[PDB]
């Protein structure tokens, strides 16, 4: 078991049930973390937004650091803390199968480049921001499978996939010996919508003669949809490697799998005005 | 097995249905089969409607699985003769290739079409002798499958050598039958359909010529590419109204009022229509040339007139005719397009406007806005009546008697 | 019994269905459905319809899905859940219902489809998220390709090369693929050969359904996805045609989609108001200031103008298209062609029937080349064939054309309109595909020169059989007016201050006032006289247009303007037969007959110089000038 | 949809053909018979419209549609005569048509010793449908025969309109209480819109005192048909009342209600909406419905007041 991974889980569940901010018009302490869960009932949402401002403000910073710096591996370890909170809250929002829930995480410090994009920022919690070109169309994915044996007739639930199409090589009942014959069950499969997004610099970055470099974003959650050509958006998630499959020496091939979109053009006609005298200093 | 029983009288049945078969107290089947030694053609073409009424179970055993009475068939007429090629000619009902669904599988259906195009000639394994590499072992294999098109599964027991000395092989030709136009619903495009031929079948047909071909529909491994094997390439009231109707010294009166009766006037008009669509004499000399029968007729004027009103009333009537535009058709629209097929890496005619439409009237819009690369094989079609082309290493001449 | 078939004791729906002590009194509730449901008439709604398909040999039976929920609710609820396994034992439902009127069917068709119809919820291509998977959705759009029919695969049996036994039947599916490891005589892994003697074949078609051009937001592009038609559905789907897909929304697993960087099997497919809607069009139609009242609310936007909007009102109607004993087809869509100096409003106008014509295409003259009005002949990047894909003029059948700036178009492309304006076809014969497509819509253009001095054969880049093929000429001249300037600043300025029940309510109130007819009820008053009521010519002075040509013709040749041919004398009968439709009448009077007259007139007469518009304004001053 | 022609001179064979075509087809189609040239002389005494209420004359009910009934001769204190001297002499034309009809449909039921009855008292009036330069009606009488051409649709089960045209031939309409008198065997149809504003009807009616079979002896033929035929006001509390009785337009749209609720989801209960409860709550419904006919007896079903928000 993973000593590191078990404490921020157990770290991130209560961040989500004892911060709140307290309002400033009322001037009671009202939770918006708590509030958030179950706004996510009635609407049958399955993304959260959690603030990073928030996160920094609580044990002097020390759980924002360790999901910065290292997200990849924490990835496993948010989602399921999350699951507990809303079980303990409103339980219903489980059942359809279990539901698939993400944390898309917005107002982040850094804004990286599309430049500034190196080896060593790879499983870290970034920032890139730069203008939409071309979009895919919204197609789904295998997330959690579930392979059935032709031979033990074994439901082999909880089956990730790790952008390819992997299959289980051992059959859970100890009296098969069955390492290929597998069928993919469609109705014990967990399925989400992903769509790639290919990013490029920004318009009001004009150099020297230098080259258009372009971006392959990954969008998962309810991110589908969200980035329009032409406008210029905040993305927010994390730099992954997407091998080739067409190939299966192996050639990489450098993604950014975000999970909150920010549009900066977008941001009721006299709340314009609140927004941006709030903003500033 | 109960399948080595039943096949003996199914053998002797055709022995014995040639022997007694006559009409008009004459051997037909005995005589054509006396006749095809001399001459050496193994061939013999059998009327399907001449074993309705010899024996029911005959005809009935044949229309359902062709697969097995057909190869059976060939055998007795060589017993007899003591390969031969079976051909079989049906004069029943036409049916279209729109009309084709799955009810038609494995059974024989009879269509009418003209021909697109014809490839070159392949070779089929029949007959096919393997050798071991080690113990150098020869075995003959007869290769059985006549609803095959290409080497579907070879069956090999692999150190075994396939020799090409002592092994015998048979002719075959793709061809690609396409619908009648008169047929085709508006809106919609005439689809196609690819044939195979076997033995004589070969080289014996003329890309652009409407002929009766009957054959199996059945389906292969390439969803699934559907295919025909070609088998056999083959009232009195309404002859008196129209010898009736020549009588009348009015009828070029009446037959130019009624075409385009949209169109008021024109009376020199509408009566080269007439004269167009009944065309000259096709004569050929004995010395090799032949003579320009069809009428062109070129139409020039203001806009307004009801210019295109006039070319579709033309193709409505003609049996045969095809309309088409100035810009919207170019080289491989007009005349004959060579393109290669990606999956056989063999590169296939296709037909055009003036090749599909052999033997009728050709209605071209926009003749002035026509470009200078699509005009040269118009000039040539107007005289010699034959497009001749020579690319890709494919020197084919089509005949285009438009 | 009923009340135990509610209560799922099973972890999901498709569990529940395929259990056997379930499935045999969900079959059984189904049978008697089909018997004992009858209609408000006393008269069995199933009863006739099973006697009708063994008369036509069909195997498509519909039943409706209103008629259904309103009795029991069981097999409503599962039907929208799990379509997979309902329609699987519905279809052996339907068989033995015929079985029992007609025992001799079962030789003719062995399996007979259930073709749902009517859904209460509908969605479009753009709503389709993952929520809606294994789902019968009903989706609506204008199909645009389609390919051919190609033999699919069902129970696919396989022979053995080591002993020549036959193994199956196997189910096909359109997922994954049949592996035979091990056979049942002989114990090898061999390669097996289908047999194509013994497999029962089915159709298939794959066609690419597109969003309609009346429901895409502004400013969007729309989206576009896969339909297949199995056993008779193919061949029915045309491109060029609104048909309403109601079929379930499915995926697919592409080797491609992976490693690069949604298909709808349809049931049923139906081509394309209420009672409440249909009494409200007499009430209206019925005054004698229907047509003024229809002039006015076009384009609500625009002040003024008023004789360019007659010419986009009655293009949007159309005339009557018949055939001549099966020889020439007249047209009947009105071409309007939109001159004049810019900043009239000229583009605004264009934008207005795009979002109330039921399919209206927009396009330009800089962008659109040869292939972006006409079809094409293009390469799949996938299938390796040649493909056609359609443009402007193909993907607009039955609707209205507009194409923005017709001045600054090609020599290439102003040649493939005119073919099209007259035998309303496209012809296009390009890679070997000799196709004869159609091509029947409005074309409504508006282009740019306005020197009032200068005919319009030199102040337009055109030529004269272009000009001559549009019916109305819409000539707009820019004056100098201090009366009309005050109008239109105040009417600009009213419109740009208005742009949680009690808000909405408001907002409302300010956009009809603004209009006075509201332009909801405007859209649906052109499509209901364009496919029901059709006006003839019978009982009209064929006098009066004999006369109305003679002198028009007269003073063109001794003053030197327009040459006027037998086009413009066809263009009457059109606009007069949209007259006509405007006043849901079936008989054009003497009414409609005047007031089309005056149109070609002012388009012909303002087409001029100076010194000709202030001539033939004082003679043809008779026929403009009704009693 | 077939539309079968036969003679009806042979008639005088095909007895069984017409009992089996009033099941599917249901609405008969004639054409010869003794009336053919004096049918278009009818025209001349129909533009009269010169008769009060008292059920004769025309019916000006409020626009453009009216009916012209004329009553019959030896009803007593019910007699308004005018101008329609035509109309008259078919009256007596016609009749043998209404008894014939009845020797090759109610003869093969049973017997012929009950169709004599009905069609005894001569008390049947004839209607004259006109038009001024269309709800959905339900006919009154138990047989009807009206020369037209269109006019008639349907409301052959795909619920759509059907304008059929066969010039001179005879369209014949089945009633309403004709289906109960045959175990329910009969299917109505109304008409639709169109250019031909200009059609005769003619509706036979039983007599006032005859039974109904077994189902109808506590209510009469002259009860029941007079139930529809008033609705178009002597008395008018009952017929205000009788508009209103029509339930099925208020308490229809409730058995879809739910159900088109219910699958945007998949109420009280938290358990969707299971088809035990769903089945239990529409008879409910019509139970609850029923107890507020019953205890009122002008209700025009008034609504119920919403929430409304605080402050």
Request: hydrophobic letters at 35%; one cysteine or more; glycine letters at 4%.
């Amino acid at each position: 078991d993973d000593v590191t991974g078990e404490k921020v889980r157990e770290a991130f569940e209560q961040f989500l049930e004892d911060f709140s901010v307290q309002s400033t018009d009322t001037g009671e302490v009202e939770k918006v973390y708590r509030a958030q869960i179950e706004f996510m009932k009635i609407y049958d949402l399955n993304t959260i937004y959690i603030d990073y401002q928030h996160l920094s403000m609580r044990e002097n910073g020390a759980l924002a650091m360790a999901i910065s710096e290292q997200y990849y591996r924490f990835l496993p370890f948010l989602q399921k803390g999350l699951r507990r909170v809303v079980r303990k809250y409103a339980p219903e929002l489980l059942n359809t199968t279990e539901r698939v829930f993400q944390i898309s995480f917005f107002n982040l410090p850094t804004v990286h480049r599309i430049r500034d994009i190196r080896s060593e920022k790879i499983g870290s919690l970034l920032s890139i921001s730069g203008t939409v070109t071309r979009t895919s169309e919204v197609r789904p994915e295998l997330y959690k499978a579930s392979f059935t044996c032709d031979m033990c007739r074994a439901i082999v639930d909880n089956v990730e996939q790790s952008f390819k199409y992997t299959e289980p090589t051992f059959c859970p009942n100890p009296s098969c010996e069955n390492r290929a014959f597998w069928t993919l069950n469609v109705t014990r499969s967990r399925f989400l919508d992903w769509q790639k997004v290919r990013i490029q610099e920004n318009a009001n970055e004009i150099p020297t003669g230098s080259m258009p470099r372009t971006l392959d974003v990954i969008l998962r959650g309810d991110s589908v949809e969200r980035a329009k050509p032409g406008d210029r958006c905040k993305f927010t998630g994390v730099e992954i490697v997407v091998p080739d499959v067409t190939q299966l020496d192996l050639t990489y091939k450098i993604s950014f799998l975000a999970c909150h979109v920010i549009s900066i053009g977008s941001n009721d006609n006299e709340r314009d005005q609140e927004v941006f005298l709030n903003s500033l200093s | 097995s109960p399948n080595d029983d039943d096949n003996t009288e199914i053998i002797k049945s055709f022995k014995n249905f040639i022997l007694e078969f006559r009409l008009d107290s004459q051997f037909i089947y005995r005589d054509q089969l006396r006749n095809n030694i001399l001459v050496k053609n193994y061939s013999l073409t059998v009327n399907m409607e001449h074993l309705i009424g010899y024996n029911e179970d005959i005809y009935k055993k044949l229309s359902d699985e062709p697969s097995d009475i057909i190869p059976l068939f060939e055998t007795a007429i060589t017993q007899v003769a003591k390969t031969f090629q079976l051909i079989l000619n049906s004069n029943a009902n036409q049916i279209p290739l729109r009309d084709l669904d799955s009810e038609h599988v494995s059974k024989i259906v009879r269509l009418s079409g003209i021909i697109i195009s014809t490839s070159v000639l392949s070779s089929r394994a029949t007959y096919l002798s393997i050798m071991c590499r080690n113990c150098r072992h020869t075995t003959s294999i007869t290769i059985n499958n006549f609803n095959s098109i290409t080497g579907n599964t070879v069956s090999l027991p692999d150190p075994y050598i396939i020799i090409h000395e002592s092994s015998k092989f048979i002719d075959q030709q793709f061809l690609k039958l396409q619908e009648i136009p008169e047929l085709v619903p508006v809106g919609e495009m005439p689809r196609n359909l690819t044939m195979t031929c076997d033995r004589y079948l070969t080289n014996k047909v003329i890309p652009g010529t409407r002929v009766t071909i009957v054959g199996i529909y059945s389906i292969y491994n390439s969803i699934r590419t559907p295919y025909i094997k070609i088998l056999g390439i083959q009232t009195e009231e309404e002859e008196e109204e129209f010898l009736q109707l020549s009588r009348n010294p009015k009828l070029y009166e009446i037959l130019t009022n009624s075409i385009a009766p949209s169109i008021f006037g024109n009376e020199d008009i509408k009566k080269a229509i007439v004269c167009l669509l009944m065309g000259g004499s096709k004569k050929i000399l004995p010395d090799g040339m032949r003579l320009r029968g069809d009428i062109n007729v070129l139409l020039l004027g203001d806009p307004g007139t009801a210019k295109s009103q006039l070319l579709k009333f033309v193709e409505k009537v003609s049996p045969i005719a095809v309309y088409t535009s100035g810009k919207g058709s170019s080289a491989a629209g007009l005349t004959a397009s060579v393109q290669r097929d990606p999956m056989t890496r063999e590169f296939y005619l296709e037909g055009g406007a003036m090749v599909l439409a052999d033997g009728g009237v050709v209605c071209i819009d926009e003749f002035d806005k026509m470009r200078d690369e699509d005009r040269v094989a118009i000039h040539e079609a107007m005289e010699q009546q034959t497009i001749s082309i020579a690319k890709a290493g494919i020197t084919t001449v089509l005949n285009s008697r438009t | 019994t009923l009340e135990s078939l509610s209560n799922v004791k099973a972890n999901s729906y498709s569990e529940w269905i395929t259990q056997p002590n379930v499935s045999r009194t969900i079959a059984r509730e189904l049978k008697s459905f089909l018997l004992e449901y009858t209609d408000e008439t006393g008269r069995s709604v199933y009863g006739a319809r099973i006697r009708t398909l063994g008369e036509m040999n069909s195997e498509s039976l519909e039943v409706n899905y209103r008629h259904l929920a309103e009795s029991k609710a069981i097999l409503a609820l599962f039907l929208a859940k799990c379509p997979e396994e309902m329609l699987k034992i519905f279809d052996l439902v339907a068989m033995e219902a015929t079985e029992l009127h007609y025992p001799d069917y079962a030789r003719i068709h062995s399996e007979i489809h259930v073709r749902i119809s009517d859904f209460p919820t509908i969605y479009s291509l753009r709503e389709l998220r993952e929520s809606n998977l294994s789902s019968l959705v009903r989706v609506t759009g204008v199909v645009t390709r389609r390919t051919g029919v190609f033999p699919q695969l069902k129970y696919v049996k396989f022979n053995c090369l080591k002993c020549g036994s036959i193994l199956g039947p196997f189910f096909q599916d359109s997922n994954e693929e049949i592996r035979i490891s091990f056979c049942t005589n002989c114990k090898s892994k061999g390669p097996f050969r289908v047999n194509g003697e013994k497999t029962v074949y089915r159709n298939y078609q794959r066609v690419t359904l597109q969003e309609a051009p009346g429901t895409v937001p502004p400013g969007r592009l729309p989206r576009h996805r896969e339909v297949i038609l199995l056993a008779d559905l193919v061949d029915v789907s045309k491109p060029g045609e609104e048909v309403e897909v109601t079929g379930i929304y499915k995926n697919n697993y592409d080797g491609n989609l992976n490693a690069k960087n949604t298909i709808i099997e349809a049931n049923s497919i139906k081509r394309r108001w209420t009672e409440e809607e249909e009494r409200e069009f007499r009430k209206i139609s019925r005054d004698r200031g229907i047509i003024d009242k229809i002039i006015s609310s076009m384009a609500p936007s625009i002040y003024g103008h008023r004789d360019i909007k007659t010419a986009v009102a009655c293009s949007l109607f159309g005339g009557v298209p018949k055939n001549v004993n099966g020889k020439h087809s007249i047209r009947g869509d009105i071409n309007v062609l939109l001159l004049g100096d810019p900043g009239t409003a000229k583009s605004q106008i264009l934008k207005y029937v795009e979002k109330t014509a039921h399919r209206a295409v927009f396009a330009t003259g800089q962008g659109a080349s040869a292939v972006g009005l006409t079809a094409s002949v293009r390469k799949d990047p996938i299938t390796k064939e040649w493909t056609l894909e359609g443009g402007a003029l193909v993907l607009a059948d039955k609707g209205v054309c507009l194409i923005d700036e017709f001045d600054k178009m090609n020599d290439q492309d102003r040649t493939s309109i005119h073919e099209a304006m007259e035998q309303q076809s496209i012809s296009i014969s390009k890679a070997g595909i000799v196709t004869t497509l159609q091509a029947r819509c409005s074309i409504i253009a508006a282009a740019n020169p306005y020197n009032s001095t200068l005919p319009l054969a030199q102040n337009v880049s055109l030529t004269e059989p272009i000009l001559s093929r549009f019916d109305i000429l819409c000539v707009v001249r820019d004056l100098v007016d201090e009366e009309a300037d005050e109008r239109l600043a105040t009417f600009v300025v009213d419109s740009h201050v208005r742009s949680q029940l009690n808000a909405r309510q408001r907002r409302l109130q300010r956009q009809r006032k603004k209009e006075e007819i509201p332009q909801e009820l405007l859209m649906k008053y052109i499509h209901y006289a364009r496919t029901k009521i059709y006006p003839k010519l019978h009982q009209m002075d064929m006098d009066k247009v004999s006369r109305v040509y003679a002198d028009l013709r007269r003073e063109s040749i001794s003053t030197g303007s327009f040459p006027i041919t037998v086009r413009h004398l066809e263009s009457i009968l059109r606009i007069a037969e949209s007259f006509a439709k405007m006043r849901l009448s079936e008989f054009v009077s003497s009414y409609d007959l005047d007031r089309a007259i005056k149109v070609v007139v002012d388009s012909f007469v303002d087409a001029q110089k100076v010194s000709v518009r202030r001539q033939l304004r004082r003679s043809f001053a008779i026929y403009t000038l009704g009693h | 949809l077939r539309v079968p022609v036969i003679d009806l001179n042979r008639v005088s064979q095909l007895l069984p053909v017409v009992r089996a075509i009033l099941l599917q087809h249901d609405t008969f189609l004639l054409k010869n018979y003794a009336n053919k040239a004096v049918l278009d002389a009818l025209l001349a005494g129909l533009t009269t419209k010169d008769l009060p209420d008292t059920s004769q004359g025309f019916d000006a009910n409020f626009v453009w549609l009216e009916q012209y009934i004329f009553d019959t001769d030896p009803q007593l204190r019910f007699d308004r005569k005018c101008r329609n001297e035509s109309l008259c002499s078919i009256y007596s034309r016609l009749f043998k048509l209404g008894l014939f009809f009845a020797q090759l449909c109610v003869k093969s039921v049973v017997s012929s010793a009950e169709l004599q009855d009905c069609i005894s008292t001569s008390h049947y009036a004839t209607k004259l449908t006109r038009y001024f330069n269309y709800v959905t009606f339900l006919p009154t009488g138990v047989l009807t025969i009206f020369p037209c051409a269109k006019a008639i649709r349907y409301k052959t089960t795909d619920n759509s309109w059907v304008s059929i045209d066969e010039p001179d031939c005879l369209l014949f309409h089945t009633g309403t209480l004709l289906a109960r008198w045959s175990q329910g065997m009969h299917t109505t149809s109304p008409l639709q819109i169109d250019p031909r504003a200009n059609i005769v009807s003619l509706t036979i009616w039983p007599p006032l005192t005859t039974p109904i079979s077994s189902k109808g002896e506590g209510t009469i033929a002259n009860h029941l048909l007079e139930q529809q035929i008033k609705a178009f006001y002597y008395p008018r509390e009952l017929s205000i009342l009788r508009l209103q009785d029509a339930m099925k337009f208020v308490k229809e749209l409730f058995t879809v209600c739910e159900t088109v609720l219910s699958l945007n989801a998949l109420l009280p209960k938290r358990d969707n909406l299971t088809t035990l409860t769903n089945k239990s709550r529409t008879l409910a419904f019509v139970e609850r419905a029923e107890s507020w006919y019953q205890q009122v007896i002008s209700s025009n079903s008034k609504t119920v007041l919403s929430s409304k928000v605080q402050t």
